[PDB]
């Protein structure tokens, strides 16, 4: 399929919407980037999807989100990266099950079946105020013990 | 807080539940694992959370889900045939804040759950709808499952 915009929501008290527009693709790497006014290219949120069929037939797929913070010059950036390793014998079902289940972990699965926190929540600060296991864990840099 | 069970849903036509039980933590690394019948220890679904302070002060945080598939016998548990591994790594420099990390984790999670050209789009990773993930056209849902992203 052709790249489209990808529209995201941050966790601010008044949740802000980020629109990532298609920039470039070469068949195995595709780049989307925000086009916010008065921000240099190296300060824009950037999403990259890349994939490779490795020599042994395993597929390695990666989605990487980079959020730079400006001092200008870039002061630093936070990067979040999902890699899926799918050996040659793997099936559609294997990959769907694994992606769904890990996504559920990231969105706050816990000891009760079905628990989730929407990554499109309109509720400000809902992620930074969450006690859910891996939501709190990544944000506070410490997993359950 | 202490580890608890982590209960997940697969994408089967009748969605099935997986209960990952806390195994062990050493502060550096915490492990949960399913206890399905007739499956060897290395063949169980396994979730690992770990963190490392890099030499420049950046924290590298990782959550890894391993989903093994067993060989088919022609009951004692068969050998493991292969594993599909999905892993999320967060790189958080020393200057980064709680708000930085919350924003990035929320937004990448939204990508994985099917964000698209319309504000608010999401497919629940706890969906009770059978096959919803493998049937989806949403950009990074279809992309990971079919092993290629939009171009």
Q: What is the DSSP string of chain A?
A: -----EEEE--SSS--EEEEEEEEE-SSEEEEEE--TT--GGGS-EEEEEEEE-TTS-EEEEEEEEEEEE---EEEEEEEEEEEEE-TT--HHHHHHHHHHHHHHHTT--SSTT----TT--STTTTTT--SHHHHHHHTT----
B37–A contact, CB cutoff 8 A:
no
3-class SS of residue B51: strand
Q: Measure CB to CB from residue A94 to each of B22, B69, B122 and give the nearest one.
A: B69
Instruction: Tell me, yes or no, if A33 comes closer than 8 A to chain B by beta carbon.
Output: no
Contact list in B for residue A15 (CB cut-off 8 A) is none
Question: Cβ B30–A80 below 8 Å, yes or no?
Answer: no
- Return the number of other C-beta atoms located less than 10 Å from residue A90's C-beta: 22
Residue numbers of B between 132 and 151 with CB closer than 8 Å to A: 133-134, 137, 139-151
Q: Could you give the CA distance from residue B71 to residue B79 in angstroms, rounded to a whole number? A: 6
Tell me how far apart the alpha carbons of residues A89 and B110 are, in angstroms, rounded to a whole number: 29
Run of H or E including B33: strand B29-33
Pairing of strands B29-33, B17-25: antiparallel
**A37 to chain B, closest Cα gap in Å:** 19
Resolved by? X-ray
Query: Tokens at residue B45, please?
Result: 């679904």
What CATH code is assigned to A6-140? 3.30.380.10
Contact between chains at B116 and A6 (C-beta distance less than 8 A): yes
Q: Are B2 and A145 in contact (CB under 8 A)?
A: yes
A6: nearest CB among B18, B49, B115: B115
Q: How many Cβ atoms from other residues are within 10 Å of residue A111's Cβ?
A: 15
CB A113 within 8 A of CB A100: no
Tell me how crowded residue A46 is: count the other CB atoms within 10 A of its CB: 20
Q: Answer whether A137's CB lies under 8 Å from B49's CB.
A: yes
CB contact set of B14 (below 8 Å; sequence gap of 6+): B130
Q: Coil, helix or strand for B144?
A: helix
Rounded CA-CA distance B133/B137 in Å is 9
CB of A23 within 8 Å of any CB in chain B? no
| Chain B residues 61-90 with CB within 8 Å of chain A | 61, 63, 65, 67, 69, 81-90
Longest CA–CA span in chain B (Å) reads 57
Give the distance, in angstroms, between the CA of residue B34 and the centroid of all CA atoms in the same chain. 14
State whether B144 and A61 contact (CB < 8 Å): yes
- What b/e readout covers A8-21, taking b as 16+ CB neighbours within 10 angstroms? bbbbeeebeebebe
Cβ atoms B98, A139 nearer than 8 A = yes
Interface test with A, best of B110, B121, B128, B140 (most A CBs within 10 A): B110
Interior CA angle at A17 toward A46 and B120, to 5°? 105
**Spatial distance between the Cα atoms of A52 and B149, rounded to a whole number of angstroms:** 11
Q: Give me the half-sphere count of Cα atoms (radius 13 Å) on the Cβ side of residue A74.
A: 14
Quick one: which of B110, B61, B95, B102 has its CA closest to A118?
B110
Question: Could you state, in order of their start, the residue ranges of all structural domains in chain A?
Answer: 6-140
What one-character DSSP code corresponds to residue B146? T
Q: What separation, in Å, do the N-terminal and C-terminal C-alpha atoms of chain A show? A: 43
User: 């949403």: which residue's tokens?
Assistant: B138
Which among A67, A100, A141 is the nearest to B103, CB-wise? Answer: A67
**CA-CA distance, B69 to B81, in Å (whole number)?**
6
Kindly state whether B12 is in contact with chain A, defined as any CB-CB distance less than 8 angstroms: yes
Tokens of B24: 């062990």
Using H for helix, E for strand and C for coil, what is the string for B62-129? EEEEEEEEECCCCCCCCCEEEEEEEEEEEEECCCCCHHHHHHHHHHHHHHHCCCCCCCCCCCCCCCCC
Rounded distance between C-alpha atoms, residue A44 and residue A66, angstroms: 8
Q: What tokens were used for A39?
A: 């921000």
Task: Provide CB contacts within 8 A for B50, sequence distance 6+.
Answer: A143, B28, B29, B30, B61, B62, B64
Return the SS3 of B138: coil
CA torsion sign for B101, B47, A90, B126 is negative
> Cβ-count burial of B87 within 10 angstroms (0-12 exposed, 13-18 middle, 19+ buried)?
middle
The span from the CA of A140 to the CA of B63, in Å, is: 14
DSSP B41: G
Which chain B positions have a beta carbon within 8 Å of A138's beta carbon?
A: 61, 63, 88, 90, 101, 105
**Chain A within 8 Å of B35 (Cβ-Cβ)?**
no
Spatial distance between the Cα atoms of B56 and B78, rounded to a whole number of angstroms: 45
Pairwise CA distance, residues A141 & A134, whole Å: 10
For the domain B6-146, what is the CATH superfamily, name and number? Answer: MS2 Viral Coat Protein (3.30.380.10)
């Amino acid at each position: 399929p052709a790249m489209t915009n990808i529209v995201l929501r941050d966790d601010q008290t008044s949740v802000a919407t980020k629109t990532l527009i298609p920039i470039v693709s070469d068949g195995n790497m595709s780049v989307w980037r925000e086009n916010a006014a008065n921000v240099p290219i190296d300060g824009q949120i950037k999403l990259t999807g890349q994939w490779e069929r490795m020599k042994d037939g395993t597929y390695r797929l990666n989605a990487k989100l980079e959020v730079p913070v400006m001092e200008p010059k870039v002061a630093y950036k936070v990067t979040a990266s999902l890699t899926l390793y799918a050996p040659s014998r793997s099936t559609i079902a294997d990959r769907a099950n694994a992606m769904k289940m890990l996504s559920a972990v990231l969105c706050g699965a816990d000891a009760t079946a079905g628990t989730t926190l929407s990554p499109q929540s309109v509720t400000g600060d809902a992620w930074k105020n969450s006690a859910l296991p891996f939501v709190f864990g990544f944000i506070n840099q410490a997993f359950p013990t």
